[PDB]
Write a protein that binds this ligand. Sequence first.
Ligand SMILES: O=C(NCCCCN1CCN(c2cccc(Cl)c2Cl)CC1)n1c(=O)[nH]c2ccc(-c3cccnc3)cc21
Ligand SMILES: O=C(NCCCCN1CCN(c2cccc(Cl)c2Cl)CC1)n1c(=O)[nH]c2ccc(-c3cccnc3)cc21
Lengths: 361, 357
Amino acid sequence: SMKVSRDKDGSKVTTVVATPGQGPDRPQEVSYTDTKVIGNGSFGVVYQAKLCDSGELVAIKKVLQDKRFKNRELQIMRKLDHCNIVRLRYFFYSSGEKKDEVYLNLVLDYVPETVYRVARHYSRAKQTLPVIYVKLYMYQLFRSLAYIHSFGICHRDIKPQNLLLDPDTAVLKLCDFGSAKQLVRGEPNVSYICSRYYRAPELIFGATDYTSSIDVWSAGCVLAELLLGQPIFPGDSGVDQLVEIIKVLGTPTREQIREMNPNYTEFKFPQIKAHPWTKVFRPRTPPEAIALCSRLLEYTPTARLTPLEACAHSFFDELRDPNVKLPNGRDTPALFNFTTQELSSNPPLATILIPPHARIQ
Amino acid sequence: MKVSRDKDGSKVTTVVATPGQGPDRPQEVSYTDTKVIGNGSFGVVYQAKLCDSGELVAIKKVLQDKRFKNRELQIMRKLDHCNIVRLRYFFYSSGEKKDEVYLNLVLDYVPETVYRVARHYSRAKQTLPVIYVKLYMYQLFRSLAYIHSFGICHRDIKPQNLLLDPDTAVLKLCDFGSAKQLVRGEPNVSYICSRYYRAPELIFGATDYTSSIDVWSAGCVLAELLLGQPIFPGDSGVDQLVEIIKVLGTPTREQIREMNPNYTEFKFPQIKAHPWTKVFRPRTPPEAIALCSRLLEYTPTARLTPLEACAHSFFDELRDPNVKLPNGRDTPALFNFTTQELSSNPPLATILIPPHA
Ligand SMILES: O=C(NCCCCN1CCN(c2cccc(Cl)c2Cl)CC1)n1c(=O)[nH]c2ccc(-c3cccnc3)cc21
Ligand SMILES: O=C(NCCCCN1CCN(c2cccc(Cl)c2Cl)CC1)n1c(=O)[nH]c2ccc(-c3cccnc3)cc21
């Protein structure tokens, strides 16, 4: 149930009773106004709303609630709490008119800009994002990936559209968990998740025994795109993307084929040697960034870096410099305030992750 | 290849090329005015003018694997159809050092494609006249009925692969880099076919699919020409399935077993079947809506064969003896069927070939 009303200046206000996203189930009286639609598609409509009291802007994801099972995104969103993940403030159920169908509303943090929109503005002006921002956005994504992977939850849809950016604070928050799912060894999963360009080779080969490493490949496809100004593995068909992968990574050996999809889909590829990774990017592309891309874009899924090992890479050493700042003057966002839940994949990696200056009493 | 010029400063290339059809008899062919008309993945496709007849030709220059012969070349030499681009000659050449051998496919030049025309009416916010939808869909179905008679599946039907001669209204199928003979028992890769036009069994990851995936891709083109935009869009396979469930409704458990028998272990929301007539514009012809409902079916076997599509009531205006092109010309070749074409259903010749043929 929701109560529609107006203010005393004629502005219209919706008042619902929602459950906090985290903490005890103590229902709340939330009132929002200025409801604009900010894009839809497949799952439903995502609105933007202004809270009546604090004046904060928020997003509302309105999807149709299956009366069978509870919504999977809601259950994963309620388990998460990370600074680089969009926060679920409240959630409530409602309807439209009749339909006799139940809609689930997800009240989440509003973030003005996305990685996809930032990378385009630079691409449309024939320019590249400053590397300091490439380091910051990739590191924060790798931090969020290490957090959800510690729960076995794979995002299964890492694309620049799903990475939100506050341009003032350079804070990146991973969003859209409608494709996320806990991956248990031995259980099969669908091979048609993840958007194009950023699908892992084992996903193109239709494997159902993939791990959380498919997020690492998609993250490497984001880093390579921000460095190249365009997608590194483009293509309309799965055949088209695999050609561009062999163009850079080289022809996968029969062992690398077995490690991706052991089914061996029975296809013979053209033999092309390994494109020297340095020749792929611009001249002044940092060498450590080229090294990180090759360590993330590997055929063998087990050979790719874990999200925690990616954060400790030498490419992010500048973000650990104690004098590092944003170009606009402010400090960097929280980068070293990990949790024990976060280091659980490799606690000894904290020696590199938290740098000498962050351990000062 | 012997590069040379003329006497007016034009530059002329002369190679020794084997005709695609007929017997192997390398010819001394010469062409000029070579321009790049697109590339991506396979290689660059050029355009040139034959030095004799002045005929425009398209040259597909891919790289040749020294192991196996090119599958696209062996398929090109077997095909000869009025609605398929013709491989006139083919020859090998290099490019600097590399030590790598390229294969050049001299194909017919056709100025327009279905994509460039359909993208354009949509930009002007107008729909393609149904007469051109009938002419283009029928010629595509005739080409699929031909290649399916040899068991060859195109596996990449999209408007960008449907060439168009705007004067003669002739449609020609091109790009067979994903073509392959589908034999029962042997599996096939599931990552062929472009987005928007992939069959449902392809997105589920099936390897036991048939040539009916071309019929689904054909149905996705017909619905696009009636709507003015892709009917099943989406950046992911999950997003494409949703747009399919919105239209076709939730597939039953028997339909899932016929698509991908593996059952990829997913639960989908239960949405009722969107009435097909409420998907298109109001004045959309009913026989076009009925034809779409018989092409975009979940179970691959329940989709119309490319021959049974040519006999549909939607194409009845094409068999009227007084039909003409909007520009005044006559309709191109539509009824000169061969025994190879009608092998999938010979009794369909009573409907396919009208009295005045
Ligand atoms: O996008 C946000 N801010 C950008 C300002 C509006 C301009 N955008 C342009 C880009 N666009 C977009 C991008 C990709 C897919 C889709 Cl379907 C859309 Cl519509 C969103 C609107 N979000 C925000 O501030 N909190 C959020 C919480 C959840 C989601 C989300 C995103 C995707 C799926 N599910 C939930 C998004 C936001
Ligand atoms: O394309 C043809 N004519 C249209 C020319 C101009 C019309 N537009 C011009 C621009 N173009 C374009 C733009 C960007 C990229 C690409 Cl790739 C393209 Cl095509 C779209 C059409 N072809 C023709 O006449 N005989 C052929 C034989 C084989 C093939 C072929 C093509 C690809 C793969 N395999 C076979 C193509 C033709």
